[PDB]
């Protein structure tokens, strides 16, 4: 039941977000931490590896 509760929490948190047409890189930074270009390994531009 606790896992279920966490899963709903995630579900509504994911369902309730602004249309992308107004969103910003920051929005995807918070909602999806997977888009954060870790400066702890890639400081210099483009952060994302050049070999990709």
């Amino acid at each position: 039941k606790t896992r279920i509760q966490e899963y709903e929490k995630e579900l509504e948190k994911m369902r309730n977000i602004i249309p992308f047409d107004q969103m910003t890189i920051e929005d995807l930074n918070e909602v999806f931490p997977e888009t954060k270009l870790d400066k702890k390994k890639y400081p210099y531009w483009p952060h994302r590896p050049i070999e990709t």
């Binding site: 899963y7 995630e10 579900l11 994911m14 369902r15 992308f20 047409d21 995807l28």
Partner: protein
């Protein structure tokens, strides 16, 4: 060529939002499945 230059911007932006929105539409059903 100036009259056929918004198509590249379309492919740059519409698909950029398309991959995000398909990820969202899949993620909602993924949480549903869980």
């Amino acid at each position: 060529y100036g009259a056929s230059v918004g198509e590249f911007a379309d492919k740059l932006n519409e698909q950029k939002i398309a991959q995000l929105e398909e990820v969202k539409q899949a993620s909602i059903k993924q949480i549903q499945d869980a």
